Design a binder for this molecule. Structure first.
Ligand SMILES: [Cl-]
Ligand SMILES: [Cl-]
Ligand SMILES: [Cl-]
Ligand SMILES: [Cl-]
Ligand SMILES: [Cl-]
Ligand SMILES: [Cl-]
Ligand SMILES: [Zn+2]
Ligand SMILES: [Zn+2]
Ligand SMILES: [Zn+2]
Length: 226
């Protein structure tokens, strides 16, 4: 299908968004409602995700996290705002989005001319640092720069699932905006946290991996050109 929504563990679901270049996002079905992690590529892809969500739960979409300022994590924002869902990010992500959205949209349209010329839609819930949602069961944190300067990890402690964002994935991928030397230092900062991890969800390629995805990408980025 164009998009799928699939249970990984308990209330934790993976979204495979096969629009444009495949990106994987997540959904958490909570007591009061639904948290989306990654806004998806466009307002259209966001509507498609919302349609899948409504087939699983009647509860409201409470909030959507922009895990970085890029089009694949924030492109859906217009749609999420339109249904009254909070759009959530760190201050850094919001500031970079304000300054650099036009440029990341232009860069996206270079490789994907079919991609829409989306206007800026900023987060309206902006956090000073690390933060949690869903009674502490969804935990967003910064461990340094990697694919972008601002990209955060999202950890689900009950299910021991780590969302890898654009930071962790199977293929080395486009290193254009990447801090290549800092990248492994961020992954080692993550390792030093010693989070219990059974599952890592890569933000591109095939989503479902074990904790080895971290080591897999670390080895790839340490061999990169640059
Ligand atoms: Cl399922
Ligand atoms: Cl353009
Ligand atoms: Cl990222
Ligand atoms: Cl593998
Ligand atoms: Cl694996
Ligand atoms: Cl792996
Ligand atoms: Zn990106
Ligand atoms: Zn990405
Ligand atoms: Zn793997």
């Amino acid at each position: 299908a164009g998009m799928s929504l699939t249970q990984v563990s308990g209330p934790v679901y993976v979204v495979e968004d096969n629009y444009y270049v495949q990106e994987n996002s997540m959904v958490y079905f909570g007591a009061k409602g639904v948290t989306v992690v990654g806004a998806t590529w466009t307002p259209d892809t966001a509507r498609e995700l919302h349609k899948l969500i409504k087939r699983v739960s009647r509860k409201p979409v409470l909030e959507v996290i922009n895990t970085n300022y890029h089009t694949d994590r924030a492109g859906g924002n217009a749609y999420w705002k339109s249904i009254g869902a909070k759009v959530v990010s760190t201050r850094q992500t919001r500031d970079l989005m304000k300054s650099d959205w036009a440029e990341i949209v232009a860069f996206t349209r270079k490789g994907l001319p079919e991609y829409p010329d989306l206007p800026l839609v900023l987060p309206n819930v902006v956090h000073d640092g690390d933060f949690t949602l869903q009674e502490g069961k969804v935990r967003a944190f910064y461990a340094g720069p990697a694919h972008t300067p601002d990209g955060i990890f999202v950890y689900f402690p009950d299910e021991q699932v780590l969302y890898g964002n654009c930071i962790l994935k199977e293929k080395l991928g486009n290193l254009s905006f990447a801090d290549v030397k800092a990248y492994p230092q961020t992954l080692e900062r993550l390792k030093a946290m010693k989070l219990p991890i059974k599952t890592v969800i890569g933000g591109h390629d095939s989503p479902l991996h074990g904790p080895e995805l971290i080591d897999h990408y670390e080895a790839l980025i340490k061999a990169a050109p640059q």
